Amino acid sequence: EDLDALGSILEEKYGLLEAHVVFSPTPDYAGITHDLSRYGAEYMHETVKDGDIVGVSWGTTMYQIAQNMQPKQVKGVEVVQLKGGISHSRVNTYSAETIQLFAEAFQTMPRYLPLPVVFDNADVKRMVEKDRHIERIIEMGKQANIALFTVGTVRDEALLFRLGYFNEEEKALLKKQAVGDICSRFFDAKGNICSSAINDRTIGVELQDLRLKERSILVAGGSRKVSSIHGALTGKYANVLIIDQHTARALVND
Amino acid sequence: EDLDALGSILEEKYGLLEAHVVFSPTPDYAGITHDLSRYGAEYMHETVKDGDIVGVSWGTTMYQIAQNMQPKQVKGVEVVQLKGGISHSRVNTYSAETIQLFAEAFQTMPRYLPLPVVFDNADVKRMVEKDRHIERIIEMGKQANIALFTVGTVRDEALLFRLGYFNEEEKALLKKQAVGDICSRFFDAKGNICSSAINDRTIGVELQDLRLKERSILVAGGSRKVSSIHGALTGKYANVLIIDQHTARALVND
């Protein structure tokens, strides 16, 4: 693959500011993850500058990126959480450590979002987001000029299907209609929010706000995530894509 | 000091199930803290048994106890957070790590309380506590038969006075009337909640619920905490006290 050329195709196809088509020797998930994670860290290091407000998220890919981060002597940087929290899982989300590592690399301390990912009732979610203290955190998430995230998939094993937040109807709807999530907000193959009812009781950065950011950075790859990435990029939620060449070719071939 | 006799005085004076008066060679805060932390971990190890629900909290003493924890082959144990979260501080609270270390030592995974310590409005706090998912976490906190905490003080330094949660009037009230906090709930020298108005918009285990537990364990010491410990014990919020022999003598002397 001509990574430059292949990046150009993606930039044209989805209207990206930048598409970084990273060499990975093989197409298996772990290798792709290792290479994108390393590339991600360097990019963040190159890109982050005095005064930036950096919105981050949590998940296995994000954690690996965080671990790879190298210290950078920058000032006035804030690092804020964009994704809500869960109350229990058998696997550690490493959410705290992830934002800690990011914060430390940029000479600041985490701005946490101390809320659950979902409320049972949208009226409660709305009054929580209007809490004077919470609103400031959400506002910092909007002000963020860099946002860093991966996409999740809609497999049976997905975390968010396994936490009691959704009844039979809701899980079936998401499995049928959604291709993935950004920060726990589920979208379809055209980038549309699948269920406004569900999304209206979910906490985290609003997907439409991502489109406004100077750099909205999606790091993702693996055949498992092709539909998800396509949906996210069709919805135009990222302007910078970090992706390996196997996945990048899979996206073009349709 | 005769530790056993001095423990007996404390058990009678405050009506404690157990008073563990721990030897520390000096009245130095750090030294007291190191010895109490170690004794704490040992006690927790001895005490925790198959099927216990353990309520923990976060802070520097708690973090230290968690670090000293040794693995225990126990089963069916749940470990749950009793103390709400903050959104930022310049010092890491180690809240995540603290509850992780406790959970791992007891062969389980943390049950987080993904909420802020304070809401601006009590009607919002109440609606959040009644959220179906949140209510289960609070219920687990109530069901907990072991609770582990220290007391905080009311000095100008105190975290909770520096986070925007309280206006001038409220900070002055707590400074004048409170002697300390347990899990961010402020009480006076007689153990009474200082401000029901503030307390009604604060998240975390309710102090009155601590009195019902099989073991409500207070680890605390240092001349800085004499008034705080006295208030907490006068309110009878702990039935097990882990304290060094300097502080313990200071309590008897009034």
Closest CA–CA distance from residue A165 to any residue of chain B (Å): 8
Provide the residue type at B212 as one letter.
Answer: L
Provide the residue type at A81 as one letter.
Answer: Q
- Tell me the domain boundaries of chain A: 1-254
Structure tokens belonging to residue B31: 């030294």
Residue A157: CB partners within 8 Å, gap ≥ 6? none
Radius of gyration of chain A (CA): 17
Q: What residue of B is the nearest CA neighbor of A91?
A: B109
Q: Does B107 touch chain A (CB under 8 A)?
A: no
B27 to A26, B7, B33: CA distances (angstroms): 62, 17, 10
Q: What residues of B are in contact with residue A109 (Cβ under 8 Å)?
A: 88-90, 92
Q: What residues of A are in contact with residue B127 (Cβ under 8 Å)?
A: 124, 127
Residue found by looking up tokens 């809240």 in the block: B95
Closest CA–CA distance from residue B69 to any residue of chain A (Å): 19
Structure tokens belonging to residue B34: 């190191």
> For residues A162 and B209, what is the distance between their CA atoms, to the nearest angstrom?
31
Q: Which CATH class is domain A1-254?
A: alpha beta
> For residues A125 and A119, what is the distance between their CA atoms, to the nearest angstrom?
6
Q: What residue of A is the nearest CA neighbor of B111?
A: A88
Nearest to A175 by CA among A192, A148, A190, A153: A153
Nearest to B72 by CA among B97, B50, B53: B50
Using alpha carbons only, what angle is made at residue B36 by residues B156 and B55, rounded to the nearest 5 degrees?
Answer: 80
Q: Does B167 touch chain A (CB under 8 A)?
A: no
Nearest to A188 by CA among A149, A237, A222: A237
Cβ contact (<8 Å) for A124 and B119? no
Provide the residue type at A234 as one letter.
Answer: T
- DSSP structure string for A151-187: -B---TT-GGGSSS-S-HHHHHHHHHH--EEETTEEE
Q: What residue of A is the nearest CA neighbor of B138?
A: A87
Q: What residue of B is the nearest CA neighbor of A107?
A: B90
Within 13 Å and on the Cβ side, how many CA atoms surround B148?
A: 31
B89: nearest CB among A100, A109, A116: A109
Structure tokens belonging to residue A58: 């949590």
Residue found by looking up tokens 């409170």 in the block: B178
A20 to A36, A59, A218, B98: CA distances (angstroms): 10, 21, 10, 39
> For residues A150 and A48, what is the distance between their CA atoms, to the nearest angstrom?
18
Cβ contact (<8 Å) for A120 and B127? no
Within 13 Å and on the Cβ side, how many CA atoms surround B70?
A: 9
Cβ contact (<8 Å) for A120 and B131? yes
Nearest to B195 by CA among B210, B209, B181: B181
Q: Does B152 touch chain A (CB under 8 A)?
A: no
H helical segments located in chain A: 3-14, 29-47, 60-68, 95-105, 122-129, 132-143, 168-177, 196-199, 207-210, 226-234, 245-253
Burial tier of A232 (Cβ tally within 10 Å: 0-12, 13-18, 19+): buried
Structure tokens belonging to residue A238: 């990222």
Structure tokens belonging to residue B197: 């108005």
Q: Does B85 touch chain A (CB under 8 A)?
A: yes
Q: Evaluate whether B147 touches B40 at the Cβ level (below 8 Å).
A: no
Q: Does B230 touch chain A (CB under 8 A)?
A: no
Q: What residues of B are in contact with residue A120 (Cβ under 8 Å)?
A: 131-133
Question: Under DSSP, is residue A63 helix (H, G, I), strand (E, B) or coil?
Answer: helix
A133: nearest CB among B92, B112, B116: B116
Structure tokens belonging to residue B170: 């409220």
Using alpha carbons only, what angle is made at residue A252 by residues A246 and A253, rounded to the nearest 5 degrees?
Answer: 85
Q: Evaluate whether B190 touches B232 at the Cβ level (below 8 Å).
A: no
Technique behind the model: X-ray
Cβ contact (<8 Å) for B109 and A90? yes
> For residues B127 and A123, what is the distance between their CA atoms, to the nearest angstrom?
10
Cβ contact (<8 Å) for B131 and A124? yes
Structure tokens belonging to residue B163: 């986070």
B119: nearest CB among A96, A131, A165: A131
Cβ contact (<8 Å) for B115 and A119? no
Q: Does B116 touch chain A (CB under 8 A)?
A: yes
Resolution in A: 1.8
- DSSP structure string for chain B: --HHHHHHHHHHHHT-SEEEEE--SS--HHHHHHHHHHHHHHHHHHH--TT-EEEE--SHHHHHHHHH-------S-EEEE-B-B-S--SS---HHHHHHHHHHHTTS-EE---SBSB-S-HHHHHHHHTSHHHHHHHHHHHH-SEEEE--B--STT-GGGSSS-S-HHHHHHHHHH--EEETTEEE-TTS-BS-HHHHTTB-B--HHHHTTSSEEEEE--SGGGHHHHHHHHHTT--SEEEEEHHHHHHHHT-
Q: What residues of B are in contact with residue A124 (Cβ under 8 Å)?
A: 127-128, 131
